[PDB]
Write a protein that binds this DNA or RNA. Structure first.
Lengths: 181, 172
DNA sequence: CAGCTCTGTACGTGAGCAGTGGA
DNA sequence: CCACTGCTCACGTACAGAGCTGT
């Protein structure tokens, strides 16, 4: 229902659990609010102006940020996705990453990665911490970074100011690598 | 898109504006469980056990309650709507009411009615209060009852029940 | 006991909204 | 004509409360 906005040689690709009802209707990646995503991006410095879901297709290629989503179907969401739903979901994800070889995969939401590690790596992870996870996407030099959901539904991060921090860190990792070159 | 759920011999027909995302996605009417509507229904004796949104196809059955909305095009908000879609919205609605002929049309907001008026009867209705309104549906004996939103009262539900009981009662 | 799959909740913020009562 | 209370929602995620566990 909600397409991918991937190109080759992306620095960052943002992975979302699934598209919300609002995103399904609206057709563009991260509308809301509550979605910090757009605000955080501008706040973090990842974009120098504030933009919004209407600009989602400009992001690879102005910014080299592509969107995609672990599960393409729309739910409310998110509590309603089966446990098997993601499993067949993430598999497709890997293949995408493999093809596209972005520098960094950014997992918007710990629930995503928590199942991802379990099923793609085969590791139940202890007490996950946001930020960089050790591993690479298997046939590629693409690094996984985990970040709390943009969705305002998670309580522990009340505001865009609360999650901006990860976005700043992500930018750092980006121009670390880009820089070494 | 969301169905109408209407039967010929209905007492109450419940009329929203457009369906919303949740309603359209679930395929059923007033789905919550943060919608008061099902609670209100049960509390005020209209149902006698607490139903839930999926049970909306059985309400014309034993309860005589049908659902509709003024504009069937789905949308998050009202704000998303040209008046033109309402204008066309209104005519269509009226037709079905004329056709199905329920005792009472119940307006799910003051808002819907507020514009139903100027579309249909071409007036503004000054310092509107809830409850039974004076006019009937054009060319019909169907009444208009406006009660407050389900989204926020239980009293008016009971009133509506009673009014229904009166209407039933006169004919008998 | 910590250690650990289960469910299973009760979490803060803001846009949005229905209704009311004001510059 | 717009400023009010209070109320669901939103691409979740953190912690008590069960029923199991080992040198």
């Amino acid at each position: 229902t909600l397409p991918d906005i991937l190109t080759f040689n992306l620095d960052i690709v943002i992975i979302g659990i699934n598209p919300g009802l609002m995103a399904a209707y609206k057709g563009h990646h991260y509308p809301g609010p509550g979605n910090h995503f757009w605000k955080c991006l501008f706040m973090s410095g990842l974009s120098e102006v504030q933009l919004n879901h209407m600009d989602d297709h400009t992001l690879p290629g102005k910014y080299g940020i592509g969107f995609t989503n672990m599960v393409e179907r729309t739910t409310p969401g998110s509590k309603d996705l089966s446990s098997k739903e993601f499993r067949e979901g993430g598999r497709i994800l890997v293949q995408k990453l493999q093809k596209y070889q972005p520098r960094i995969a950014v997992f918007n939401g710990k629930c995503i990665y928590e199942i991802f590690s379990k099923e793609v790596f085969g590791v139940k992870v202890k007490n996950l911490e946001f930020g960089l996870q050790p591993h690479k996407i298997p046939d590629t030099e693409t690094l996984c970074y985990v970040m709390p959901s943009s969705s305002a539904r998670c309580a522990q991060f009340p505001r865009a100011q609360d999650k901006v921090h990860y976005y700043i860190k992500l930018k750092d990792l980006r121009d670390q690598l880009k820089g070494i070159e």
